[PDB]
Short mmCIF file of C-alpha atoms and ligand atoms in Angstrom, two decimals:
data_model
loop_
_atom_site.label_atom_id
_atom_site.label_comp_id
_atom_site.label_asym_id
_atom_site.label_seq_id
_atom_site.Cartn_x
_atom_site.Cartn_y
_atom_site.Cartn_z
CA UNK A 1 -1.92 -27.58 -10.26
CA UNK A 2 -1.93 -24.15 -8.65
CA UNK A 3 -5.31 -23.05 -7.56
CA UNK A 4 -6.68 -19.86 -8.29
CA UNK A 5 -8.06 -17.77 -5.76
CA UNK A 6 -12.11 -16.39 -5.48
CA UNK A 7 -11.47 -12.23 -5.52
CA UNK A 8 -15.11 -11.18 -5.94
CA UNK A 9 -15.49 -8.00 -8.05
CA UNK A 10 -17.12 -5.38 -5.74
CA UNK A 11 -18.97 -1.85 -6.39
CA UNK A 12 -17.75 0.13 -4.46
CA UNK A 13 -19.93 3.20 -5.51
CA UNK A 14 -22.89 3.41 -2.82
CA UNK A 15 -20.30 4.15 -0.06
CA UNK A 16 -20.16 7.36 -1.83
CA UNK A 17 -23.82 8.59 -1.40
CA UNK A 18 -26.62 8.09 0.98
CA UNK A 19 -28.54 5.22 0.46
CA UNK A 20 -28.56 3.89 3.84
CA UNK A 21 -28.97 -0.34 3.02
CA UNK A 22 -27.29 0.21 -0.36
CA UNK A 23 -23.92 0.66 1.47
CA UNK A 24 -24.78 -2.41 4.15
CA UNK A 25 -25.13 -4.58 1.37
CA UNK A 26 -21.36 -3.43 0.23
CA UNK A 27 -20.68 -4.17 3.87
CA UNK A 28 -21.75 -7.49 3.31
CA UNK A 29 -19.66 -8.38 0.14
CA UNK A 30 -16.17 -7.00 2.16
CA UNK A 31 -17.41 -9.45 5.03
CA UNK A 32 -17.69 -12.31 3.04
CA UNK A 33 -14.36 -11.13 1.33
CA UNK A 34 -12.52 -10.97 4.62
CA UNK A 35 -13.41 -13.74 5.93
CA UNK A 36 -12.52 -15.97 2.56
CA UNK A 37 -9.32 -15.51 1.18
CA UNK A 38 -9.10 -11.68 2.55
CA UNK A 39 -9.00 -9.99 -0.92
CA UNK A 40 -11.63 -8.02 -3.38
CA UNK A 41 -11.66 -5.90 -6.41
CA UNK A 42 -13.04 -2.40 -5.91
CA UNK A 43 -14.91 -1.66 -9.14
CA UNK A 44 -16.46 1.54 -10.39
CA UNK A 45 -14.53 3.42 -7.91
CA UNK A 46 -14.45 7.52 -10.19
CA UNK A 47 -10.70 7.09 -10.08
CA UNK A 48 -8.96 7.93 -13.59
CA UNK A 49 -6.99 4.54 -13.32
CA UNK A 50 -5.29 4.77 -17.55
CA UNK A 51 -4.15 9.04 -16.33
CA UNK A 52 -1.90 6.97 -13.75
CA UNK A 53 -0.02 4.16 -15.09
CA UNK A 54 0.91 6.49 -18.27
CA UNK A 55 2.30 8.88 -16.24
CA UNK A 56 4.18 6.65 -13.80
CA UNK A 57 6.09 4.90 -17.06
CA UNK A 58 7.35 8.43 -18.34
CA UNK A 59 8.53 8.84 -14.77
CA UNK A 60 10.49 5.65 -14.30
CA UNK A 61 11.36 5.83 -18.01
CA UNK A 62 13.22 8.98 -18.32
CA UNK A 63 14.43 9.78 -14.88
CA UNK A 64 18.57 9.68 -15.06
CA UNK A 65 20.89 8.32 -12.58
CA UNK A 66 21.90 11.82 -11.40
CA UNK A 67 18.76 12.51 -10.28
CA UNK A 68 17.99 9.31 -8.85
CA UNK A 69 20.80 10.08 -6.61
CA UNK A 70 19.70 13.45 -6.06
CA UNK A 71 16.53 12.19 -4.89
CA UNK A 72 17.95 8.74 -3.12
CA UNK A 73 16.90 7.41 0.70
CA UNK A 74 19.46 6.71 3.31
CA UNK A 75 19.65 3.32 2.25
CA UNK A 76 21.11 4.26 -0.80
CA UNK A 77 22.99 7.86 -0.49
CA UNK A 78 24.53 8.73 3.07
CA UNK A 79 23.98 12.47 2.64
CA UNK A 80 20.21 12.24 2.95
CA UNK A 81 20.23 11.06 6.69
CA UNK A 82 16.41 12.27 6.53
CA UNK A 83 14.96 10.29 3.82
CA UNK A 84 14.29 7.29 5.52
CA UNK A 85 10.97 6.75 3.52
CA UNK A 86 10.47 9.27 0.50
CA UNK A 87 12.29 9.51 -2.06
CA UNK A 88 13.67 6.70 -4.66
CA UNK A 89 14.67 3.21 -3.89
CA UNK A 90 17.25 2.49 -6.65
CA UNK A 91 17.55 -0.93 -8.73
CA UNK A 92 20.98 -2.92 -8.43
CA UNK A 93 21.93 -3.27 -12.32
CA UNK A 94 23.28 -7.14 -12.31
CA UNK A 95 21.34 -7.82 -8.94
CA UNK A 96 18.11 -5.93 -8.31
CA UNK A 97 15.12 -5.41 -10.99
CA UNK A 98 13.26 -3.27 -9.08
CA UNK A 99 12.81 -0.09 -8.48
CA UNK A 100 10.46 2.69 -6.82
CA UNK A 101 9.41 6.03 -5.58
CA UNK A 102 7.98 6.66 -2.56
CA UNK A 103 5.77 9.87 -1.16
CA UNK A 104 4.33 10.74 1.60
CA UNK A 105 1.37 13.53 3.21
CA UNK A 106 1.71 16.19 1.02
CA UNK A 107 0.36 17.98 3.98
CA UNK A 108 4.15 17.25 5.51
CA UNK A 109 5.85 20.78 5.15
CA UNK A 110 8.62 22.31 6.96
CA UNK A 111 6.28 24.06 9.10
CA UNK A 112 3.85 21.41 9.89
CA UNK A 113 3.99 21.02 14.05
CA UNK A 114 5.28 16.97 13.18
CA UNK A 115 8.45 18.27 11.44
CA UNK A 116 8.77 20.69 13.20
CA UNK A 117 9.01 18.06 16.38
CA UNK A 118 10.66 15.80 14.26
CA UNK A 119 8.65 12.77 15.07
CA UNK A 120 9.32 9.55 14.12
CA UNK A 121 7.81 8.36 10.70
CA UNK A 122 7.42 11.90 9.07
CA UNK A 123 9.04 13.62 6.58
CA UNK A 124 8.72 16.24 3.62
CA UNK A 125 8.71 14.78 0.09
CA UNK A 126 11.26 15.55 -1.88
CA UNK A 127 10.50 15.64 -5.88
CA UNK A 128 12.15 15.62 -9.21
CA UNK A 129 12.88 18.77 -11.29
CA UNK A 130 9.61 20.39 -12.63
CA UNK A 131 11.70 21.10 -16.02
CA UNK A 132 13.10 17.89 -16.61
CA UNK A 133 9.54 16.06 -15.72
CA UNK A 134 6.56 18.75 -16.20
CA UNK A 135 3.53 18.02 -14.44
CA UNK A 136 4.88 15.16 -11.86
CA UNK A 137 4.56 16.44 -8.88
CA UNK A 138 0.80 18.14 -9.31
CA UNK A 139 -0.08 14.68 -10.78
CA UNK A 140 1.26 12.80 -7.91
CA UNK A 141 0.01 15.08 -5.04
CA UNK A 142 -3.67 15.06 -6.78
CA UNK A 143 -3.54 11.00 -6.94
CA UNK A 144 -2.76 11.38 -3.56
CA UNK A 145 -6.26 12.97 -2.60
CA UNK A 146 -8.27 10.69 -5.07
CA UNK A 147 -7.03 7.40 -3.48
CA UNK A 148 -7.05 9.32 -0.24
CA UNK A 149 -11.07 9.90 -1.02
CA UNK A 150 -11.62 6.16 -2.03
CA UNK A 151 -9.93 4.98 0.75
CA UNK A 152 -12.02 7.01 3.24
CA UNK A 153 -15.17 5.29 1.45
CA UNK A 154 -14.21 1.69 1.82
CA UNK A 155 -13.48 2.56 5.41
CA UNK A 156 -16.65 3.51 6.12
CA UNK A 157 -17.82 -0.05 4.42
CA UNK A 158 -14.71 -1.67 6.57
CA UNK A 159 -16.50 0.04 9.55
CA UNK A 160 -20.65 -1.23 8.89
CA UNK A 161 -19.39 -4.41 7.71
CA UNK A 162 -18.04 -4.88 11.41
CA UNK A 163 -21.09 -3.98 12.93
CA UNK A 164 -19.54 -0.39 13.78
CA UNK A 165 -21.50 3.40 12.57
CA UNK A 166 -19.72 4.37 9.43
CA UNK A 167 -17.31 6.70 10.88
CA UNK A 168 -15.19 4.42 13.21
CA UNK A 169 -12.03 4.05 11.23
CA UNK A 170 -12.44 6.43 8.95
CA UNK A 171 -12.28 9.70 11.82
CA UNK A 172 -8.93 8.65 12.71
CA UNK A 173 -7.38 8.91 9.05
CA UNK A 174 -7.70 12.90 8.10
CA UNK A 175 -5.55 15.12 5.48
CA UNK A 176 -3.42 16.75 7.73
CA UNK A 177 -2.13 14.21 9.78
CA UNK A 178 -2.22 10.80 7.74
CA UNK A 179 1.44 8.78 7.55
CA UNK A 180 -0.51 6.75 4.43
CA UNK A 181 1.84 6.25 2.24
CA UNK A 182 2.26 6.20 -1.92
CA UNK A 183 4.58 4.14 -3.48
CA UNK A 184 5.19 4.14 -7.45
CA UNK A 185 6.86 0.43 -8.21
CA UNK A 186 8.43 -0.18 -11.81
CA UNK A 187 9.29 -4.14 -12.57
CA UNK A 188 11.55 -4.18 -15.61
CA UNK A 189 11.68 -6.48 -18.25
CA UNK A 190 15.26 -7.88 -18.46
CA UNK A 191 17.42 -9.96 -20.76
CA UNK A 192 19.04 -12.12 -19.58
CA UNK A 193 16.99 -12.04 -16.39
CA UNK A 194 19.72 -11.49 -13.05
CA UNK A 195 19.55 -14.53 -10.79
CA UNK A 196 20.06 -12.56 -7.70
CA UNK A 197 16.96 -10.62 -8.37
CA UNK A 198 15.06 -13.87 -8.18
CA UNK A 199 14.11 -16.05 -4.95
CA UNK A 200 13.32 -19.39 -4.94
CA UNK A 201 10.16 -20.28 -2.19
CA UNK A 202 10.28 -23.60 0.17
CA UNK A 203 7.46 -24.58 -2.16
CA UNK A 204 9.81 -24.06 -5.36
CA UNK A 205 8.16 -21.45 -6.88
CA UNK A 206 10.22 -18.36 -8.13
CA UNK A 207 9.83 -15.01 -6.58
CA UNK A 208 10.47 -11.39 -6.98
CA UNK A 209 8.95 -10.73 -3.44
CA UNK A 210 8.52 -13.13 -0.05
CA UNK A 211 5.12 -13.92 1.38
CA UNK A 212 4.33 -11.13 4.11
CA UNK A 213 1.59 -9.50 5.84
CA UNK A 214 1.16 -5.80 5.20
CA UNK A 215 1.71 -3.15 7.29
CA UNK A 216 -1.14 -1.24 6.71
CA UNK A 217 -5.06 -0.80 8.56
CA UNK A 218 -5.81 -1.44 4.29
CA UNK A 219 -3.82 -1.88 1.34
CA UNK A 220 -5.43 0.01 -1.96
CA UNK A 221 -3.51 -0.89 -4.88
CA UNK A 222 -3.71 -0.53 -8.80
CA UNK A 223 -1.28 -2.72 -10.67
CA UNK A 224 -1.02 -3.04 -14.55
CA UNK A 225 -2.22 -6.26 -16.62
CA UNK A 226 0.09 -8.59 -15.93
CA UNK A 227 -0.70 -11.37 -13.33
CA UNK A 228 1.55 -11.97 -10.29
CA UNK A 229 0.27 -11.74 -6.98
CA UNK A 230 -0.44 -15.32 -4.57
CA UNK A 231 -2.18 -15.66 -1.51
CA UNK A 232 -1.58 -18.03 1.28
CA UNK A 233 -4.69 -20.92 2.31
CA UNK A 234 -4.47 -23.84 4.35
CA UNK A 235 -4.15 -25.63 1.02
CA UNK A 236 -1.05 -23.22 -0.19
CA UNK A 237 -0.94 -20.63 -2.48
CA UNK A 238 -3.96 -19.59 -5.26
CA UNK A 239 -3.12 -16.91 -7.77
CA UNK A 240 -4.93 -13.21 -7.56
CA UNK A 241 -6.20 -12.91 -11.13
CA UNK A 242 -4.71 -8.94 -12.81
CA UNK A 243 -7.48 -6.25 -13.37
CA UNK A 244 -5.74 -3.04 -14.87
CA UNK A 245 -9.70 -1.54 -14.40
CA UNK A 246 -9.79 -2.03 -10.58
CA UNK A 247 -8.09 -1.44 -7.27
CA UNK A 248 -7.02 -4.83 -5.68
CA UNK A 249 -7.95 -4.55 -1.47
CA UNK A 250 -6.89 -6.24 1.24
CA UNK A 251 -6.39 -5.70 5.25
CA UNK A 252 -3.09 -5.00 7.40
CA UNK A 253 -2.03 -6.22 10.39
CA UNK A 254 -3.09 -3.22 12.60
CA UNK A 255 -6.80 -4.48 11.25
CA UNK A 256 -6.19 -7.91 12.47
CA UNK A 257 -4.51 -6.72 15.75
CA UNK A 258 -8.05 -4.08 16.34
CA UNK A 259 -10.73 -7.17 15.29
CA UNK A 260 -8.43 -9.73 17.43
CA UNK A 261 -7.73 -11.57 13.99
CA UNK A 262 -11.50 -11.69 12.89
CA UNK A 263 -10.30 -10.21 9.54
CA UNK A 264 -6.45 -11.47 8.84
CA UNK A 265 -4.29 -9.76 7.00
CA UNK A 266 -3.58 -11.90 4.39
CA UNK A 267 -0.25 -13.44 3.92
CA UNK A 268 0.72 -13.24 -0.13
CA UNK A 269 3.70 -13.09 -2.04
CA UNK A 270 4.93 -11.51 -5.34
CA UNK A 271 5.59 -14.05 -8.40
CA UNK A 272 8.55 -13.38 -10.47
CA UNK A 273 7.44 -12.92 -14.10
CA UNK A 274 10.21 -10.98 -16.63
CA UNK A 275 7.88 -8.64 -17.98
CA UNK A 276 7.52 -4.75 -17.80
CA UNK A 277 4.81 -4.19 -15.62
CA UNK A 278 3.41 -1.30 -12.51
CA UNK A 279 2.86 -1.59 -9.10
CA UNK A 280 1.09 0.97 -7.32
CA UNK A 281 0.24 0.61 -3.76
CA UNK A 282 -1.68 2.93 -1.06
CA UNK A 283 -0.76 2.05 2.00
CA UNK A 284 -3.63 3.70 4.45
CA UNK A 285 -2.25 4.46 7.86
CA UNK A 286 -3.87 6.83 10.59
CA UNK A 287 -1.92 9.18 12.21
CA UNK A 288 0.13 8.73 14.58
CA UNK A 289 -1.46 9.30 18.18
CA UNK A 290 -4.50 7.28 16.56
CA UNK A 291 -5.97 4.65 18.94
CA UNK A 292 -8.21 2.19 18.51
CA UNK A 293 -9.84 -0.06 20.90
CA UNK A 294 -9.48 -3.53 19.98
CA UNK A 295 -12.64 -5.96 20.13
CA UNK A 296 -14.22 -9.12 19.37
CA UNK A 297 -16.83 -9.41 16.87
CA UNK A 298 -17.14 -13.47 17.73
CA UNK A 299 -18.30 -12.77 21.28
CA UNK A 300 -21.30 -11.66 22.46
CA UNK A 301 -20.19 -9.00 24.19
CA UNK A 302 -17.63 -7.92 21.78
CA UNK A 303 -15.01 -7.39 24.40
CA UNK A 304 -11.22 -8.01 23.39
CA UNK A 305 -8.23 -8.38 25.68
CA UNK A 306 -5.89 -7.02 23.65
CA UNK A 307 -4.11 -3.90 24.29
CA UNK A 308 -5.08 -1.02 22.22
CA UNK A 309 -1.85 0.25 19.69
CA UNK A 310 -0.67 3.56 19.05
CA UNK A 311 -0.62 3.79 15.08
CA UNK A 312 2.85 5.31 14.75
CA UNK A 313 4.60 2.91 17.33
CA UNK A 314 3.17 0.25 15.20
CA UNK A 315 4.49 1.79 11.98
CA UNK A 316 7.85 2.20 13.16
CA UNK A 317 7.76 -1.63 14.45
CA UNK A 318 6.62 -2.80 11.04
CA UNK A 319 8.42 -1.04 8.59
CA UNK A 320 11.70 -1.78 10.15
CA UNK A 321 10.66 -5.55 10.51
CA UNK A 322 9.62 -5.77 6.42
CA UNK A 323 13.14 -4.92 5.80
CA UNK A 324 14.83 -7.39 8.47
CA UNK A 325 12.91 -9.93 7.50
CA UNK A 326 11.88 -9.59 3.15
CA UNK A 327 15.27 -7.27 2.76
CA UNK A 328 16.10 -3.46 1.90
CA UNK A 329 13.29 -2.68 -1.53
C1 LIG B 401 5.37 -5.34 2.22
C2 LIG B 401 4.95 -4.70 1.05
S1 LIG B 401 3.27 -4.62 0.70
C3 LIG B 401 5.93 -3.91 0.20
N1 LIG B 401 5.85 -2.73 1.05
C4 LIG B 401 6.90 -2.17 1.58
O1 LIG B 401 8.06 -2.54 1.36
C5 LIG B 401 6.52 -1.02 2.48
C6 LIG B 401 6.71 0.31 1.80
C7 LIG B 401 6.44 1.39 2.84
C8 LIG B 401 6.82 2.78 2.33
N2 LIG B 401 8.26 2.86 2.00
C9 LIG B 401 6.50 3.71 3.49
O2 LIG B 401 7.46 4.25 4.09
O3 LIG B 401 5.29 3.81 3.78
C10 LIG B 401 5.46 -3.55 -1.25
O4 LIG B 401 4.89 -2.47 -1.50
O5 LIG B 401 5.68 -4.43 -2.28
C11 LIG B 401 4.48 -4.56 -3.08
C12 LIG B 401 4.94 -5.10 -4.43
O6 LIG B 401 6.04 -5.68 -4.40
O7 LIG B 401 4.22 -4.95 -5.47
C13 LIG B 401 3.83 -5.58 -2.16
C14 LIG B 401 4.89 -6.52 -1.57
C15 LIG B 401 2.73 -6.39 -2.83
O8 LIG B 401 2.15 -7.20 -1.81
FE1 LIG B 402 1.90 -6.67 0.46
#
């Protein structure tokens, strides 16, 4: 048998007032979490979770493939030498199910000083006709700010759960500056099923996606009802039980570079299942002169010898790495 994994359901709410020992006892519950198998559910969270899948079907439903290549990254269409992250990541009819969209700070304009520099890692979102999909681009740039705002709570619960005051992630990641990410992930249903599209693991299990770590401080994702997601123990892989209610979390590797591996980021994988189904992940990254000191929460005197990591040298590193080593998404 497959185990299954222990993903404790966790409200999230107090880190949103100011009850003082309310919030360390939500500190206490991501502890535990992060030190078990690294995951949690973030429940009664304010976000309008059922306004967001619907609208990300439509989307993926009745965008055309002019306009996918209108709005295509590098990997995909030559002419848009800038679009090395937003934009759309086309499926492979015959060889590729999937398929996404990805945005960026909404913040990112032609005349914000980072483009203007052209620095490494930013870029301005591009977006689909407002005639052809009314509404789209409001809705996405206001999800933005609500999973932006959630984010910036568990943070602060990241932060006490540490031992740390509230603020010590969470005044690195700011509006006008974040490189967090947004990606909007459609798995098809397909008959027959292409055989390229699926890998088989060293443990034989059939895949859609490799096992990884993410490149992320925290991952904040919503995902529709159908299970898929595995996470790595000593024992092998447990399956991560689907809630369409909540917001699965989990660290990245910058977190368990800064706490010298106290909290992992979790290695997991993506199941292949041939079923219609939504992935929608929030990738929180600071910005990209943010700094922050490792340490050692095992040692008495907390001190770490690791060297402290620039947040957009680290992005760079990563993202290119993902696609050497888990292939072009
Ligand atoms: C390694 C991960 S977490 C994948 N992420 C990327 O490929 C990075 C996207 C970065 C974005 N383009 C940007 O520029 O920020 C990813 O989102 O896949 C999710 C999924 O397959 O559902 C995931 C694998 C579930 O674990
Ligand atoms: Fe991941």
């Amino acid at each position: 048998s497959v185990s299954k994994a222990n993903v404790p359901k966790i409200d999230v709410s107090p880190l949103f007032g100011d009850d003082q020992a309310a919030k360390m006892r939500v500190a206490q519950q991501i502890d535990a979490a992060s030190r078990d198998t690294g995951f949690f559910y973030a429940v009664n969270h304010g976000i309008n979770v059922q306004r967001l899948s619907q609208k990300t079907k439509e989307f993926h439903m009745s965008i055309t493939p002019e306009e996918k290549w209108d709005l295509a990254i590098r990997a995909y269409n030559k002419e848009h030498q800038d679009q090395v992250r937003a934009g759309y990541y086309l499926s492979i009819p015959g060889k590729k199910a999937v398929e996404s969209f990805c945005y960026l700070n909404p913040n990112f304009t032609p005349d914000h000083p980072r483009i203007q520099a052209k620095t490494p890692t930013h870029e301005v979102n591009v977006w689909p006709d407002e005639t052809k999909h009314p509404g789209f681009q409001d809705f996405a740039e206001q999800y933005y700010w609500d999973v932006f705002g959630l984010s910036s709570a568990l943070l602060k619960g990241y932060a006490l759960a540490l031992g740390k005051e509230e603020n010590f992630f969470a005044r690195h990641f700011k509006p006008d500056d974040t490189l967090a990410s947004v990606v909007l992930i459609r798995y098809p249903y397909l008959d027959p099923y292409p055989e390229a599209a699926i890998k088989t693991a060293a443990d034989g299990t059939k895949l859609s996606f490799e096992w990884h770590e993410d490149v992320s401080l925290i991952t904040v994702l919503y995902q529709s009802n159908v299970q898929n997601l595995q996470v790595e123990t000593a024992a092998g892989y447990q399956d991560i039980e689907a809630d369409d209610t909540g917001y699965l979390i989990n660290c990245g590797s910058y977190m368990a570079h800064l706490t010298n591996n106290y909290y992992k980021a979790p290695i997991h994988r993506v199941k292949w299942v041939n079923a219609e189904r939504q992935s929608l992940p929030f990738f929180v990254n600071l910005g990209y002169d943010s700094v922050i000191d490792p340490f050692d929460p095992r040692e008495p005197n907390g001190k770490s010898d690791r060297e402290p990591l620039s947040y957009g040298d680290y992005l760079q590193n990563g993202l290119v790495s993902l696609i050497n080593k888990n292939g072009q998404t």
